Design a binder for this molecule. Structure first.
Ligand SMILES: COC(=O)c1cccc(-c2ccc(O[C@H]3O[C@H](CO)[C@@H](O)[C@H](O)[C@@H]3O)cc2)c1
Ligand SMILES: [Ca+2]
Ligand SMILES: [Cl-]
Length: 158
């Protein structure tokens, strides 16, 4: 089992880290949601789908930068919603193909009432997401760590 990002980088068998740069919504109001769909960005595959089932969970989601200060969020993992920054680990999605498929996570962030001006800054770290891979074959328990960066400023009008 390995993963890749849409821009290039790969995390190989056994785990690692990688950076993911994402465009964010330029303007979001109090009462609106910023959606950050990471499933257009991170993809994974099973290296032996013919006997092995890989189980993948979102083990941890943390917020950094402006997301941490200025937003409150939920994370949607494979169609279900949990608070964000995460307070538990998610259920498991299955991987059973050798074709890369999205890791189905999206963040939903809405600005807190005190937010105004530039609420997220271009180039900055906004989240660290940990993907955890295990299987029905051995004791492998691996961490794929995704460091998420903003490509642009996000403004909360005021
Ligand atoms: C045609 O023959 C094959 O393709 C073939 C034939 C023999 C062995 C294997 C094999 C076994 C374990 C293995 O281990 C890696 O891949 C597993 C499946 O993703 C994960 O469960 C693990 O954690 C680890 O990443 C990767 C590949 C593949
Ligand atoms: Ca491979
Ligand atoms: Cl890959």
């Amino acid at each position: 089992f390995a993963c890749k990002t849409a821009n290039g980088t790969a995390i190989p068998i056994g785990g690692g880290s990688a950076n993911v740069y994402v465009n964010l919504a330029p303007v979001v109001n109090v009462g609106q949601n910023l959606v950050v769909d990471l499933s257009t960005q991170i993809f994974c595959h099973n290296d032996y789908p013919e006997t092995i089932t890989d189980y993948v969970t979102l083990q941890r989601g943390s917020a950094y930068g402006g997301v941490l200060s200025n937003f409150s969020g939920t994370v949607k993992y494979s169609g279900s919603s949990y608070p964000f920054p995460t307070t538990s680990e998610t259920p498991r999605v299955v991987y059973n193909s050798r074709t890369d498929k999205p890791w189905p996570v999206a963040l939903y962030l809405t600005p807190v009432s005190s937010a105004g001006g530039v609420a997220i800054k271009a180039g900055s770290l906004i989240a660290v997401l940990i993907l955890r891979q295990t299987n029905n074959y051995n004791s492998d328990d691996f961490q794929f760590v995704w460091n998420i960066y903003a490509n642009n400023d996000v403004v909360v009008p005021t």
